[PDB]
Amino acid sequence: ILPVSMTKTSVDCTMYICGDSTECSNLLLQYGSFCTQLKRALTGIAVE
Amino acid sequence: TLEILDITPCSFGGVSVITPGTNTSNQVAVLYQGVNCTEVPVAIHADQ
Q1: Of all helices (H) and strands (E), which one includes residue A39?
Q2: Which residues in chain A have their CB less than 8 angstroms from residue B14's CB?
Q3: How far is CA A30 from CA A11, A17, A22, in A?
Q4: Which residues are glycosylated (chain B)?
Q5: Do A10 and B11 touch (CB under 8 A)?
């Protein structure tokens, strides 16, 4: 028995940490591309 | 006034776009993850 693949998971960073709050999103983009890096990293796992 | 109302979310931040390459063409196809084709106008509030 040999595992071949995991389960792909994708997360929306803005929705995860700033729920239903536009003011939170106004502060999130101030942090920078930290959210983008996490999303891009999971994309490579998913396509792998 | 005592009145029970359902709250359907209208914030779908996850959109996947299929492009054949800007150089090749501008035509694009949009994919929504895990949604019916009837709730798309409600989910992304296409009216606004």
Answers
A1: helix A34-47
A2: 10, 12, 15
A3: 19, 14, 13
A4: 23, 36
A5: no
- Tell me the β-bridge partners of B18: B29
DSSP B1-48: --------------EEEE-S-TTT-S--EEEETT--SSSHHHHTTTT-
Interface probe with B: pick from A12, A29, A42, A43, most Cβ of B within 10 Å: A12
A45 shares contact with chain B (CB less than 8 Å): no
Which positions in chain B touch A15 (Cβ < 8 Å)?
11, 13-14
- The structure was resolved experimentally with cryo-EM
Do the Cβ atoms of A14 and B15 come closer than 8 Å?
no
